[PDB]
């Protein structure tokens, strides 16, 4: 009979007439675009207030004052910046330690004491933090900052394009997976056409390491999801950085009573302030850093509030159109395709070229590692298909499979091509 009924999209939803249709589940199909690794831009800073004029401005050379683990970690960070300021130099003796060796840029000091850091005079700054010197007060300040990639904050991200909500149905015990692309089901003596809502558009898959969390959109870096790691540090191969990068941090020596401290540092700015020591010939350092994007990202907290456990789908219901019509059975070729060549990339967003020869006896319903790439009449075929699976490629027309020739690169290799 020609019939109509609405089927809800929740677990337990089922209709009984004219033929029972049960909502078995909800899943999704897509064309994956693997972006690799993403992380927030984490400005990390360290340093030391030193009551001496050190001759080796490095983590090892400053080991007696600079915290060990933060120095080593920040030194290996992205867009490293470091400055060594001479507040009060040697009045006599020493080795390239007099005030004259601290010209702007510190080239005279660097000639005898090489360093990857900037060297600057700071003679008009307060030297009060360094006390207990009977004849010659000596004081220097070291600051080190970079964008450190924290492993606990790094997320693997897969963009989902051409998203198709899969409404898994059971029509009188027979499995039927309906989408906007394939909305028809066979019923005991007719055909069921399922009216489905539109697809949800692009999805963002945040891979926690293994758990997947879901975002709906591109994402939108201009809205509430602005702090997404996707909007920040991008590493396609989870090793090398690409695209947009902040400038090297701007380090400043700021005295405790400087009016500048009444304001907050800007993004990427690092202000260091010497703290008067409780011990003779020793001092502390107070560091004020302006994080990128005006805030520090707390990854488990961001993920929990800005993502869902499952991909989003519209509320429904589904329109079940029951028809007495039966589809015209076309002859299908079951023999595997011949001389199949696959060229390009997979999970990259650029359709790969699939070419070969479809065999006789009907249309070849071509699959590339189980992925449907369309049906082709017998003879030579050429198609541009978005592939989700890596090589080797098993090609079939619905029956037996054959190994295709492939020149296909991974998403990370595509990003560097």
Residue numbers in the entry: 1 to 209, 214 to 421
Task: Give sentences copied directly from the paper behind this entry.
Rubella virus is an enveloped, positive-stranded RNA virus with virions ranging from 500 Å to 900 Å in diameter. In this report, we have used a combination of cryo-electron tomography, sub-tomogram averaging and in vitro assembly studies to elucidate the three-dimensional structure and assembly of rubella virions. Instead, the structure of rubella virus, as shown here, has an irregular helical organization of its surface glycoproteins and a pseudo-tetrameric inner nucleocapsid arrangement.
The rubella glycoproteins (E1 and E2) are present as heterodimeric complexes or spikes on the surface of the virus. The averaged glycoprotein spike structure consists of a broad base below a narrower stalk and has an estimated resolution of 11.0 Å (at 0.143 FSC cut-off) and 14.9 Å (at 0.5 FSC cut-off). The top (external) part of the averaged glycoprotein spike has weaker density compared to its base, indicating that there is more variability in the region distal from the membrane. However, all fits resulted in similar orientations with the long direction of the known E1 structure roughly perpendicular to the viral membrane. Thus, the residual volume at the base of the averaged rubella glycoprotein spike would be sufficient to accommodate the ectodomain of E2 glycoprotein. Along glycoprotein rows, adjacent spikes were slightly rotated with respect to each other, along an axis perpendicular to the plane of the membrane. This analysis showed that along unbroken glycoprotein rows in rubella virions, the glycoprotein complexes are similarly oriented with respect to each other, such that E2 would most likely be located between adjacent E1 positions. The relative positions of the rubella glycoproteins, with an extended E1 conformation and with E2 at the base of the spike complex, is different from the glycoprotein heterodimer conformation observed in alphaviruses. The common antibody binding region on E1 (between residues 202 to 285) is exposed to the surrounding environment in the spike density, given the orientation of E1 as determined by the fitting results. In the rubella glycoprotein complex, the E1 protein extends out from the virion surface and does not appear to require E2 for shielding its two fusion loops. The observed variability in the glycoprotein spikes suggest that the tips of the E1 structures are flexible, which would help E1 to avoid non-productive membrane interactions at neutral pH.
